C-alpha cells in the first residue's frame, strides 16, 4: 500500500494520457486499468483527486460508443460517487450531462451505472438538481419508466422525487412527459414494496400541484392508489392515503370507485388514528356533490362506520369534523338519503351529534354539525328525538351569539366581515336558521321555537344583505306562519313591509319564500 499512493500517483498522468489516445483500441486498455484503480483505497483517491483523470474518464464514456469501454468508464465514476470528494469531482468535470446521455444506453450495465451515480449526486451533491434538470434528465427518467427491472425503477422514481419536490418547473415537465400516467401504471402493476413506496412519494409530491392533480386523476390514480391500502407496509399505506386526500377534491367525477370507497369505509375501523383521520377526510371529499359515491358508501355500511368514528374520536376535532361532513353529504340529495337519515338515528347517532354543538367544540366542527342536523331533520322520525336532546335551544343560542357578533362588526372590526377560528359568523347565522327552518315543519318544534321568542330576530334577518340568510329566515317564518298565533306575532313585528319588498328579490328562493309567508298570513 506504501507504493499505491506513491506509484499510482505517478501512474495517474500515465493512464490519463492513454484515455485521450486517438487509437480506438488501446483507449479501451486504460479504461479497464482505470476502472481497477477505482477499487483500491489509494488509486480511488488518486484518480478522484486527479482532476485530469475525472475529466478524461467522463469525456471517454460519452464519446466511445464501444459497448465495452462505456461501462469501464461509467463504472469508474460510480465508485467515486461513494465519496464526497468523488461526487464533487464528478460534478466539476461535467459528468452529469454525460451520465444523463448514458441513460439512453442499450447496455443495461451502463444504464444502471448511470442512474445509480446520478442518484448519489442528487442525494449528496449540492447543485446536482440544477445540472440534471439542465441536461434534461427529467424527460429522460420519465421515458425510462417503461423498463421492467424493479430495483432500477425504484432508483429512477426516487430521483424524480428528489428533483420534483417543491419545484413546479420539474413538475410541469414531468406532466408534459406523460409522467402521471406512467407512475399510475407502476402502482397498478408491480408488488416490490420499495418501488411502490418510492413511486407513491413522487405522486404525493405531484398531487399538491394544480396541473398534475387532474392529470393523475384522469390517469386513474385514485383507483390505483386504492389497490395498496391493504398492503402490509405501513409507510406505503400512509403515503397512498396522503396522496389520495390531496387528489380527492378533484376526483368527484370518476367511475369504478366501488373498490376504493369500500376500502376507505373499512379503514375507519383501523387501530391507527392517522389512517382513520385520512380515511374520513377522503370520504368527505368523494361524497361531496357525487350522488353515485354517496349511494355506494351508504351501501357498504358507511353511515354506521362514520357514527362509530365520531364516537371513537371524542374531542379530536381533526377526526370528527370530516366524519361529520361526510355524514352531512350522505344525508341529502341522493336515492338513499332517507335511509341514511334513519340509519343515523338507528345507530344511536342523534345524541352524539347534538352534543357536538356544545363546548369544547370549536366553530368549524359546529358549522359542520349544524348542517348535518338540518339534513337529519328532513326525516320526520328524527324530529322528536332531535327535540328531546335539546337541539332547538342550542341552535337558537348559537344563532343569537353569531348574529350579535356580526352586529359588533357592522361598525368595523376590520372589513365587511372576517373570520373567527376560520369561520364567518354569517355562515353560522345561515346554518342555524336553515336548521330551524326544516325543524319547524313539526308542530311541537314550532311551539318550542316560538316559545324562545325568536320571531323578532327572524324578521330582522329579512333585512340581511346576505341573500341566503334572507332565504332561510323567510323559510322559517313561512313554516311558523301556519300557526295563527305565530302569524299574528310576525305581522305585529312589522314583517309585511319587508316581505313585500322581497317579492322583487333577484334570488328566486327568496322571492318564493317571501310570497309563501304572505299567502300563509293572508288566507287564515
Amino acid at each position: 500500500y506504501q507504493d499505491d499512493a506513491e506509484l499510482a500517483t505517478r501512474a495517474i498522468p500515465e493512464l490519463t494520457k492513454l484515455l485521450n489516445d486517438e487509437d480506438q483500441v488501446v483507449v479501451n486498455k486504460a479504461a479497464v486499468m482505470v476502472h481497477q484503480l477505482s477499487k483500491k483505497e489509494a488509486s480511488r483517491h488518486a484518480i478522484m483527486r486527479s482532476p485530469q483523470m475525472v475529466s478524461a474518464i467522463v469525456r471517454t464514456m460519452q464519446n466511445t460508443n464501444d459497448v465495452e469501454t462505456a461501462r469501464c468508464t461509467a463504472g469508474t465514476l460510480h465508485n467515486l460517487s461513494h465519496h464526497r470528494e468523488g461526487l464533487l469531482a464528478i460534478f466539476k468535470s461535467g459528468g452529469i450531462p454525460a451520465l444523463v446521455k448514458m441513460l439512453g444506453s442499450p447496455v443495461d450495465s451502463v444504464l444502471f451505472y448511470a442512474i445509480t451515480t446520478l442518484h448519489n449526486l442528487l442525494l449528496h451533491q449540492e447543485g446536482a438538481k440544477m445540472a440534471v434538470r439542465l441536461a434534461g434528465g427529467l424527460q429522460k427518467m420519465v421515458a425510462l419508466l417503461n423498463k421492467t427491472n424493479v430495483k432500477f425503477l425504484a432508483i429512477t422514481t426516487d430521483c424524480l422525487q428528489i428533483l420534483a419536490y417543491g419545484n413546479q418547473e420539474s413538475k410541469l415537465i414531468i406532466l408534459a412527459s406523460g409522467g402521471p400516467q406512467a407512475l399510475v401504471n407502476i402502482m397498478r402493476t408491480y408488488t416490490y414494496e420499495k418501488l411502490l413506496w418510492t413511486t407513491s412519494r413522487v405522486l404525493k409530491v405531484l398531487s399538491v400541484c394544480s396541473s398534475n392533480k387532474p392529470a393523475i386523476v384522469e390517469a386513474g390514480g385514485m383507483q390505483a392508489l386504492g389497490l395498496h391500502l391493504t398492503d402490509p407496509s405501513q409507510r406505503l399505506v400512509q403515503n397512498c392515503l396522503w396522496t389520495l386526500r390531496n387528489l380527492s377534491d378533484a376526483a368527484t367525477k370518476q367511475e369504478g370507485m366501488e373498490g376504493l370507497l369500500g376500502t376507505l369505509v373499512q379503514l375507519l375501523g383501523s387501530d391507527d388514528i392517522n389512517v382513520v383521520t385520512c380515511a374520513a377526510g377522503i370520504l368527505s371529499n368523494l361524497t361531496c356533490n357525487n350522488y353515485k359515491n354517496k349511494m355506494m358508501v351508504c351501501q357498504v355500511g358507511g353511515i354506521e362506520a362514520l357514527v362509530r368514528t365520531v364516537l371513537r374520536a371524542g374531542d379530536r376535532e381533526d377526526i370528527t369534523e370530516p366524519a361529520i361532513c361526510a355524514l352531512r353529504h350522505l344525508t341529502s340529495r341522493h336515492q338513499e338519503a332517507e335511509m341514511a337519515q334513519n340509519a343515523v338515528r338507528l345507530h344511536y347517532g342523534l345524541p352524539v351529534v347534538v352534543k357536538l354543538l356544545h363546548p369544547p367544540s370549536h366553530w368549524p366542527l359546529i358549522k359542520a354539525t349544524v348542517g348535518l342536523i338540518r339534513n337529519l331533520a328532513l326525516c320526520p322520525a328524527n324530529h322528536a328525538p332531535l327535540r328531546e336532546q335539546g337541539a332547538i335551544p342550542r341552535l337558537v343560542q348559537l344563532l343569537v351569539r353569531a348574529h350579535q357578533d356580526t352586529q359588533r362588526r357592522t361598525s368595523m372590526g376590520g372589513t365587511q366581515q372576517q373570520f373567527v377560528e376560520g369561520v364567518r359568523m354569517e355562515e353560522i347565522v345561515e346554518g342555524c336558521t336553515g336548521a330551524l327552518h326544516i325543524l319547524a315543519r313539526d308542530v311541537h318544534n314550532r311551539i318550542v321555537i316560538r316559545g324562545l321568542n325568536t320571531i323578532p330576530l327572524f324578521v330582522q334577518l329579512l333585512y340581511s344583505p346576505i341573500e341566503n340568510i334572507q332565504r332561510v329566515a323567510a323559510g322559517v317564518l313561512c313554516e311558523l306562519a301556519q300557526d295563527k298565533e305565530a302569524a299574528e306575532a310576525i305581522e305585529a313585528e312589522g314583517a309585511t313591509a319587508p316581505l313585500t319588498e322581497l317579492l322583487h328579490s333577484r334570488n328566486e328562493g327568496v322571492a318564493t319564500y317571501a310570497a309563501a309567508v304572505l299567502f300563509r298570513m293572508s288566507e287564515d
Partner: peptide
Amino acid sequence: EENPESILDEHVQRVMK
C-alpha cells in the same frame, strides 16, 4: 462474472434498506 444487476442490488442496499 458479476451480474450487472448487483450494481442496483448493492446501491439499494445502502441508500435506503
